[PDB]
From a paper:
Death-associated protein kinase 1 (DAPK1) has been associated with N-methyl-d-aspartate (NMDA) receptor-mediated excitotoxicity, and has recently been suggested as a target for the treatment of stroke. DAPK1 has been associated with cell death mediated by apoptosis and has been suggested as a novel target for treatment of stroke because of its involvement in NMDA receptor-mediated excitotoxicity, which is believed to be the major cause of brain damage following a stroke. In particular both kinases harbor a calmodulin-binding sequence and an autoregulatory domain (ARD) next to the catalytic domain and are therefore regulated by calmodulin (or proteins with calmodulin-like domains). There are also notable differences between the two kinases, for example DAPK1 is active only in its non-phosphorylated form, whereas activation of CaMKII is more complex.
We established a high-throughput screening assay for the protein kinase DAPK1 by using a Caliper microfluidics capillary electrophoresis system (Caliper Life Sciences/PerkinElmer) and identified a novel small-molecule imidazo-pyramidazine inhibitor (6) targeting the catalytic domain of DAPK1. Therefore, we verified the inhibitory activity of 6 towards DAPK1 in a different assay: the equilibrium dissociation constant (Kd) of 6 was determined by ITC to be 0.24±0.09 μm, thus verifying that 6 indeed binds DAPK1 at nanomolar concentrations. Finally, we were interested in the binding mode of 6 to DAPK1, and we therefore co-crystallized DAPK1 with 6. All residues were clearly visible in the electron density map, with the exception of the C-terminal residues Lys278 to Ser285, which were disordered in the structure. After initial molecular replacement, electron density corresponding to a bound ligand was immediately visible at the ATP binding pocket, and following several rounds of refinement the structure of 6 was modelled into the electron density with high confidence. The electron density for the dimethylamino-ethylamide moiety of 6 was weak in relation to the aromatic part, most likely due to increased flexibility of this part of the molecule in general, and specifically this moiety extended outwards from the binding pocket and did not interact with DAPK1. In contrast, the heterocyclic part of 6 was relatively planar and slotted into the ATP binding pocket in a manner typical for type I ATP-competitive kinase inhibitors: it formed a key hydrogen bond between the backbone amide of Val96 in the kinase hinge region and N-7 of the imidazo-pyramidazine portion of the ligand. The hydroxylmethoxyphenyl group of 6 occupied back pocket I15 of the ATP-binding site and was held in position by several polar interactions, including hydrogen bonds with the side chain of Lys42 in the kinase N lobe and Glu64 of helix C. In the absence of an inhibitor, the salt-bridge formed between these two residues typically stabilizes the DAPK1 active conformation.
Numbering used by the authors: 2 to 277
The structure:
C-alpha cells in the first residue's frame, strides 16, 4: 500500500531487458529529471488469490519493506516504487557488470587469495543483512552481481530479495523454496529456518568459486535434495588438488547439517582463511 500512482513512463525512459524470472522482468532505465541510470523490476501482481500467474501482494510488500531498510556497498539499494493495474515496479540501483562467475570465467587464472577478495565482499554484504536480522534465503551465484566489470577492483552487489525475510523472535518460520543445489538441509526438510541457512549457501558458493564444481548437484532434483540432506559431498582430487587446508576447513565449517553448529557470519569473518 502507498506506492507511486503516476505513470512510471512519465518519469523514466526504459531500455534493454537485463533479466527475467517467472513473474518479473528487469530492464535498464533512465530517470528523466537527473539523467541517471537505474534498473526497473516489473513484478506481475496475481490480482486474484486463486491465480498462480503472479506474485501475492504480501510477498511484494515484504520484499519492498526489506529493501527500504538497506544501505550498504555490497547490497542493491531501492530508489522508488510505482504501481499500476497489473504491476508493481521497483526502481533500483543499477548493477551493470553481470554475474560474478561469468567475469571470473573469462580470467586466465585465479589464485585462492584473489578468490577470497571477492568472497570477502559477499561476506561483508551478508554481515550487514544478518546484523539487521535479515535472511536473504536465495544466495546463489546468479544473485551475486558486479556493479562495473571495467574497473581495477570490481565491486560485488547482492541482488534478488524475493525470498528474503526478517527473522521474527516469537514464531518459527518454515517453508520449501529456492534452488535445490544451493538451499540448506533445513529448507529441504521443512524444518525451522533462520539466518543460518544463508551461511550454508555461502559454503556452497565458496566450494564452486574455488573449483567450478557444485558440491551436491545430482542427476535428478530429488537426488540433489537427498545429497543436501545427508551432507553428501567430497573435495574431489580432480577439482581440489591445489586447494589449501584452510580453504577446505572454511567450507567444512559451513556445510554443517545442524544450523546451531554451523559457522555464523560473524565467525566466518574471523576464520584464519579470511583473516590471516
Ligand atoms: C530479480 O530480483 C531483483 C533484482 C534486483 C536487481 C537490482 C538491480 C539490478 N541491476 C541489474 C540487475 C539485474 C541484471 C541482470 C539480471 C537480473 C536478474 O533479474 N536476473 C535473474 C536473477 N535471478 C532471479 C535468477 C538483475 N538488477 N537486479 C533487485 C531486487 C530484486 O528482487
Amino acid at each position: 500500500t502507498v506506492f507511486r500512482q503516476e505513470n512510471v513512463d512519465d518519469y523514466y525512459d526504459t531500455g534493454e531487458e537485463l533479466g527475467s524470472g517467472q513473474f518479473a522482468v528487469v530492464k535498464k532505465c533512465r530517470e528523466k529529471s537527473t539523467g541517471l541510470q537505474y534498473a526497473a523490476k516489473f513484478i506481475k501482481k496475481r490480482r486474484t488469490k486463486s491465480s498462480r500467474r503472479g506474485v501475492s501482494r504480501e510477498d511484494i510488500e515484504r520484499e519492498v519493506s526489506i529493501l527500504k531498510e538497506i544501505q550498504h556497498p555490497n547490497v542493491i539499494t531501492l530508489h522508488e516504487v510505482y504501481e499500476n493495474k497489473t504491476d508493481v515496479i521497483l526502481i533500483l540501483e543499477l548493477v551493470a557488470g553481470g554475474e560474478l562467475f561469468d567475469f571470473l570465467a573469462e580470467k586466465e587464472s585465479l589464485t585462492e587469495e584473489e578468490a577470497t577478495e571477492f568472497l570477502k565482499q559477499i561476506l561483508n554484504g551478508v554481515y550487514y543483512l544478518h546484523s539487521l536480522q535479515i535472511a536473504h534465503f536465495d544466495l546463489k551465484p546468479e544473485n551475486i552481481m558486479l556493479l562495473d566489470r571495467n574497473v581495477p577492483k570490481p565491486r560485488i552487489k547482492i541482488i534478488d530479495f524475493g525470498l528474503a525475510h526478517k527473522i521474527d523472535f516469537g514464531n518459527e518460520f518454515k517453508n520449501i523454496f529456492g534452488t535445490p543445489e544451493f538451499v540448506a538441509p533445513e529448507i529441504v526438510n521443512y524444518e525451522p529456518l533462520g539466518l543460518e541457512a544463508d551461511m550454508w549457501s555461502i559454503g556452497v558458493i565458496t566450494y564452486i568459486l574455488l573449483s567450478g564444481a557444485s558440491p551436491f548437484l545430482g542427476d535428478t532434483k530429488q537426488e540433489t535434495l537427498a545429497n543436501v540432506s545427508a551432507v553428501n559431498y567430497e573435495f574431489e582430487d580432480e577439482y581440489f588438488s591445489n586447494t589449501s587446508a584452510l580453504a577446505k576447513d572454511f567450507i567444512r565449517r559451513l556445510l554443517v547439517k545442524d544450523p546451531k553448529k554451523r559457522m555464523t557470519i560473524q565467525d566466518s569473518l574471523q576464520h584464519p582463511w579470511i583473516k590471516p
